[PDB]
Amino acid sequence: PQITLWKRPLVTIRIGGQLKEALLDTGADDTVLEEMNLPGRWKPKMIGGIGGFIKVRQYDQIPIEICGHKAIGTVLVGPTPTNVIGRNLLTQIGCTLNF
Amino acid sequence: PQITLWKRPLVTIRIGGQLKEALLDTGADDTVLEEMNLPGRWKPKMIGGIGGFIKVRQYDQIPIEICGHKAIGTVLVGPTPTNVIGRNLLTQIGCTLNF
Numbered sequence A, B: 001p002q003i004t005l006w007k008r009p010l011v012t013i014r015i016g017g018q019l020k021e022a023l024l025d026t027g028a029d030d031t032v033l034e035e036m037n038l039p040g041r042w043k044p045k046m047i048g049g050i051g052g053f054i055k056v057r058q059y060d061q062i063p064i065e066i067c068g069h070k071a072i073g074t075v076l077v078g079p080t081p082t083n084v085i086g087r088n089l090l091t092q093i094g095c096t097l098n099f
Ligand SMILES: CC(C)(C)NC(=O)[C@@H]1CN(Cc2ccc3c(c2)OCO3)CCN1C[C@@H](O)C[C@@H](Cc1ccccc1)C(=O)N[C@H]1c2ccccc2C[C@H]1O
Pocket: A025, A026, A027, A028, A029, A030, A031, A032, A047, A048, A049, A050, A081, A082, A084, A086, B023, B025, B027, B028, B029, B030, B031, B032, B047, B048, B049, B050, B081, B082, B084, B086
């Protein structure tokens, strides 16, 4: 798909067998989802952005379908305003910026 | 050009006669630049990012050249760890997300 940016670049994702709305975010190094339950062992991690740092749970090697494309990588879960798919997964689906 | 996401999508920009490095961020609604004293009037504003809200100064109709392409729009100035080009400017240079 080719996506314009006049509107937030949101796509549907399926994870843990559940559907969710996520934002394709080229400025995010990692992927972070709102608080939710994921199977598997998690490790406490901290990530920072604008506003400061937050504490999150890191789940490794999680399968996730992003708008029909398949990826398997690290997924962070914590107090974020919205689900964000970062560069770690975006590259897995051959996502690029063009103009 | 086509920008890959293996690394942060950093490009050179020109604003206020100064050259800077800025991140092409599809997840940012607005454009936020590191502290710099631009001439002109501005209005106070609050923007939220991952770690909370930060107070910024909003300047309107600022000419900015992104990787050679010209654009003009609202730019927020404040204590951000990096310069961020949001969708308000990305749509002006015809930037798209592709996969
Ligand atoms: C207009 C601003 C700029 C304030 N927008 C954002 O920060 C939005 C916020 N939403 C959320 C939002 C939505 C709506 C809101 C709100 C916040 O507040 C009020 O309304 C979540 C997505 N971000 C976009 C991020 O792409 C920005 C990016 C900035 C950055 C890059 C590099 C170093 C420091 C800061 C960012 O936060 N990046 C970090 C990042 C992000 C995720 C996972 C790992 C990492 C590390 C790092 O790359």
